[PDB]
Subunit: 394 residues, 5 copies
């Protein structure tokens, strides 16, 4: 009975186009806040952040006021979209096809005219995502809210601290914070401020998943490529081992491609690491070909250069701590024996070439081991957030 009377009375002559101030010259203060419930996606290709957010607006409607003594029991009223004035606060940097992502809920008012509007939404905002340090990258995404058409002398936008009590932690992104700031922009024409409220979402990429799917597989496959330098040449499998390791890295690249960013503004950190690892596997195959050249050197070819015999068989090999009828029968038998002696000399020459091959495998083992470790440590620790990341995620 009383709310029937009240609802009839409140909408008599009410115009939802009218900003509800007693004095049209005075501004209408609107309190704007938000509540972040979820980070949904960070699209680095489309440069868009998707978030679950409940916006919180509050103001005072001069017309929706009543004496609670004349309508006992009726402390609040609800108005659906389009029936009363609402602040036209929109996300300026919206990247949604609808532009307005909010679900228009009812406006709750109490007897004194204080209106509360709690529109939920799944927002999509344009955010520049810098993947230079991927996967140890920290992103700062702005959410800029403001009145589409009212200036600061008509709509006095005020900010309140964002609520994160209901935030559901993301599995891929760590929320550093959601700080907010009120700013005013001025047009050179006029002296009216134009206010906006910007919330800067700072979020850190969790790196455990990437540690086990990109960093480790690349270290361990790189190690198996170094194993070629320990395989004896007589096996006849050095090329098989090395070339098949390279193939495994190509097949690996397929898995890596689904999670690596596709940009041309910079070479990500992990792209420098993956490329580095594959040049070292490629160069190990190249060094293996040279080693086989030495091992299979034809004994009747070119005599071991003097420099080859010094730089390898002496210096490097030390540093590495390696180390009538009767007369006719005589002629026939002297030929057989001399043939065998020539074979022995040829085999001795081949043994020197084979030992040189061994020495080059140990030099390359040592050099490639050092070079892989230096690149791995240097590339990963060049990230400013490496230490913090590993400490928090591992």
């Amino acid at each position: 009975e009383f709310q029937r009377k009240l609802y009839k009375e409140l909408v008599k002559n009410y115009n939802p186009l009218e900003r509800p101030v007693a004095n049209d010259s005075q501004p209408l203060t609107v309190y704007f806040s938000l509540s972040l419930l979820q980070i949904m996606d960070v699209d680095e290709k489309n440069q868009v952040l998707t978030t679950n957010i409940w916006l919180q607006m509050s103001w005072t409607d001069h017309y929706l006021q009543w004496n609670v003594s004349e309508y006992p029991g009726v402390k609040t009223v609800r108005f659906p979209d389009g029936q009363i004035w609402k602040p036209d606060i929109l996300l300026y940097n919206s990247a949604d096809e609808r532009f307005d992502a909010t679900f228009h809920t009812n406006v709750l008012v109490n007897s004194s005219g204080h209106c509360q509007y709690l529109p939920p939404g799944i927002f999509k905002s344009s955010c520049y995502i810098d993947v230079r340090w991927f996967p140890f990258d920290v992103q700062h995404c702005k959410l800029k809210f403001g009145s589409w058409s009212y200036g600061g002398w008509s709509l006095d936008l005020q900010m309140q601290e964002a609520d994160i009590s209901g935030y559901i932690p993301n599995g891929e992104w760590d929320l550093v914070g959601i700080p907010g700031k009120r700013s005013e922009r001025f047009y050179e024409c006029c002296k009216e401020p134009y206010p906006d409220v910007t919330f800067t979402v700072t979020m850190r990429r969790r790196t455990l998943y990437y540690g086990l799917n990109l960093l480790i597989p690349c270290v361990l496959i790189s190690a198996l490529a170094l194993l070629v330098f320990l395989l004896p040449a007589d096996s006849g499998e050095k090329i098989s081992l090395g070339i098949t390791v390279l193939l495994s890295l190509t097949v690996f690249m397929l898995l890596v491609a689904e999670i690596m960013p596709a940009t041309s503004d910079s070479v990500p950190l992990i792209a420098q690491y993956f490329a580095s690892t594959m040049i070292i596997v490629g160069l190990s195959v190249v060094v293996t070909v040279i080693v086989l050249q030495y091992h299979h050197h034809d004994p009747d070819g070119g005599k071991m250069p003097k420099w080859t015999r010094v730089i390898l068989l002496n210096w490097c090999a030390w540093f590495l701590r390696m180390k009538p009828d009767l007369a006719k029968i005589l002629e026939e038998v002297r030929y057989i024996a001399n043939r065998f002696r020539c074979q022995d000399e040829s085999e001795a020459v081949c043994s020197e070439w084979k030992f040189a091959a061994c020495v080059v495998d140990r030099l390359c083992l040592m050099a490639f081991s050092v070079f892989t470790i230096i690149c791995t440590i240097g590339i990963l620790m060049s990230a400013p957030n490496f230490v913090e990341a590993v400490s928090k995620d591992f």
Copy 2:
């Protein structure tokens, strides 16, 4: 004739903004229940549960009452969306872009004013999905429903047991249950309860599919990696076998990647199993390289260390139960015979090195077999739901 008169009479002065109670001070009891028809998806990346659900609301409208004697034949009426008051019960933790997923069906009322509202919908709710024990994981997803704007003294929300008679069993998830609970939240300002109804969907992952696509392939490929230790070195195919098995696991990883979860909150169980299996295949290739080093050992190199000949050729080899002119012609022929004797001594030394290689293959066969079995059994049975899962799904 009579329903024409009745429909005209029921909407005279009716305001769909008005909560329909005779006393505005008294609360309006709303009975809320749901009916779960289908679990559609459990998105562990976006942390969203999609379900097919028919909500069931009931209340009493003080204004929609008529004497069935004055309108014979007219026992019920139907009102479409927006024509009469409805409870504003919404899914609080909705993750839908529309926020409100319900299809607004007609409200059925009978002569005494009892209204039944059966809105169907495909709901998307935010649910934290813990994949620590994947694929033997049990998930608990909450569905929290409540009035958007009414407090407990105006809208007295009451719960009824969820209906699962129409539930269609899912092929991927086993429905443990859908228990419900009514709760009240209080603001420190005031003494009015704010009620909500939460339905907790508990669902168990069926593991048969994962048993045949991840667990078994990994066991059987791991077994083929152990086969390198049985392959004789003279084949010249040990590295080929072992390295190609590793490649097959990389290609396998591709299939596994489509179904494995991508999170950084924990290493899933199956990720520990897959990683474990691949370190053992990688280490078998490493051990094979060492074995080939022994088998192709140069006979004129370093004499078998004393420790090598004891730790291997004696202890391990026992535990494994293995085991003028005439004088000139004399000189020419004595050289030929002595050359052959030197060859025999060299070949005998090589045979010892080759037998040592055999012994290391049996040690590694035994050790790697034990270590694969222990890791497989230990990793899979570390799941609290392993026994139950295997009993129900296999």
Copy 3:
């Protein structure tokens, strides 16, 4: 002039909320039929059938009647959505986010009040898809239609045979039929029937595509795995051939994964066939390792067991139809000759071990050939729809 007058007259006092019967106690008969134009998708993961369907409803509106003599030329009228009463027939088991998939076309009425409503739509219905016999599976998907709120004493739903004259044959599914049935459900409270009309779409999976992309490739790759038993051991390529065939099957699995169903309610038929084929390829690699063990057996090792020489060299090998100074020079020359004789004896022993290896390759060739044929024939012909399928599709 006349239709202007008529349209004005027909909507005077008309209420689209009113069921249009002269007697509110009498039921309003609605004739319901459908027309199936296309099967669009059979989602076995989401358990949803998508179909192109034109629904056909007919009833009689007591109020939309006119004398065609008083409005010459005006034989029919059209009313858009919301202007006149319509039956609230909905798909009960709808799996669409909109729930109502129909496009609301105009209601055509003639002078006697007979209304025809032909709403088109792309419907999504929840259908349990049993993939036990994939790809020789027949599916039965129900389409249950009924009034959302009217009981059988108010809305007398009647069925007519579904129209399939306009059906466009699907490339993946063969339409067996679309039989319909009217049923009544009773509540224990009351004696009013609640009718519904269910159309059961029976559709058979066409198997030609699967015959050329899964069945054949698996037979032919399985055959190439058997070819290892024909490759002589001296090639040094048995392991290479066998292990690379297994890899090709893993790469094949990738193609197969895109079209195989992902369920845990049963192991599909094709999953049993693919698994079977890969265990036999895996076991051929295992048998090859054993064969190489025999072929490279060290001649100075363990004497061929007595049982080995009988079970293989005799029985299986028969069944398979296989089969001063002068004296010093004497000593030097007698050693050379005796060394050669020892070599010949050692080589003879090795030849027996090599022939045993040959015999095991023929046994395994024969056994594996038989076992592959039996599994292929047995697994595929275990499908109840195998004969029919092959006869209609090949």
Copy 4:
């Protein structure tokens, strides 16, 4: 001033439900045409054509006429959707979830009452796509337009030639033409025609992309499989080469799968070509195994059959244009010499078996080369649109 007066005057008593004819017995002629701007997609799995099309409708509204002398300056008026009568022409075979894909633009009318309606849209129509001759296939997709509810005596649909001046050429489909035809369907009840306008889009698949991604790669990989017959057996790499070529074709199949059609109504042309090529690569591996059997034939095994020595070493090999103390020392030395002579005889036998292997490689080289060329030429030129396609696209 004048258009204000005119707009007020034109909608006085206007009913948008009324077909706007002075005589309700006379039909209202509607001129229907379309303008094709783009072919967007040809979905052969879902059997749907997506096109960008601007429909063009024209008619005469008897009520929207005014004297341009009484409203100077007002030559035309615009009416938005729902304000005036429009023809209910819809795409009959629409495959869109909205069914009606048009964007409802304003209706332009001039002083004489001639209305022009230019609704744009992205249309989805159901088209049977026959991929028997893929990628040399020509498709004919119908677009059938008609009034949903009006018969030919009320709405006289007339056709005009489709406009293709604004057509943007597609990169995948060549537009042969868009011919249109007006037809009338009769119901046996009645003598009123029911007209429709059907536009048949004929489009030819461009084949350049498929020439470089499917046809060529398959020819060149097939050639590399033939290279096994030129590789000498002593390399020990024939199986490696052949088996790795087969693997490369499996990996190739992956790329081919993304662009090949998935149907069971026929085996496409390119599926016959790809299958053919892979049976020939598979059979080359089989023939290689036989060749190795000959090359490694044990010299102490079965004597070259008489037929083998004739069919190969003579006929095929011609067609291919190939081609006390002292006495003791005598005994010791006579054994050494006789041992060597036996070795020479054994080696001579082996040389015959090795030459037979060479002859079989040349026969197979020649035969497989011929058979690959015949299948390639025969399969591709069996397409009725092959010559035209290659001439226009290459």
Copy 5:
């Protein structure tokens, strides 16, 4: 109070169908501009450009004017969609399913009647994307805006320079510019211009990403294919190396396929480069087979042709700077010695054939190296935007 009075006064007798000019014969000038915020996607398959754009329209409404002295404090008013007249400017070449992508914001008017309309939107326009020079391609995409129904004598469209102050740089596309142009089209019927405003977006593809994912991997894998010519034939791994490199390129093609364009209007630049590289790897395998033919040439076969011994062993080999009882014992021993001499002659012949094989590997090394460099440099530098691209992106 004053804005309530004003809003009531402004909509008295206002018709949003009326073009708001004091003189219906005079045109209404509309100022049209846009603001480009983001390039979202360049779909070269669907030929569609997606952009984030805020349109800017301005005009003068003759009816929305008021004296600011009679309504103090009320300087501006806002009107939502449908309440006042708006220009019907649409994107002519829209490729959106909605056709109209704008979000209809409020129209801001001031006391003098100047209306500002700032509709945001995510636009999809049809743009022909020429990928002939991919990835060094520059695209020109037009955005054509105009009134749907008004001619130039009723709606005088005027252009203003596009605003790019808020443009967010894209990671894949470099914005060269957004120049605009006003044009008039005439119908031969009449002398009224029909104006439109076209904005031509010129954008350059950034090539850093493609440099590291397509250009480099193809160079480095091509280099590893050249390494076969340095591998000695005795290794028995030349075919293994070469054939596995080809496989790695096939697996590589998979990654390349996701980013390469699929068109039949031309062969892109990168498709010519990738094809070129793979023909050279294929031909290296072919040349390797020929080399092995020489190396394993049977010594008792065909004598080195005279031309072979000149073209290779002399010219090319120079250019490349390469280079009673007693008598019985005599007979037995003379046979042994002569057997060895025959072996030496046979081995000498084989050495010539093996040296010829070496010479062919160096010729092919040199020739293939030159041919790879020429094709790489020639194909990439044939792009008109190569120099500029590399200078700006690397």
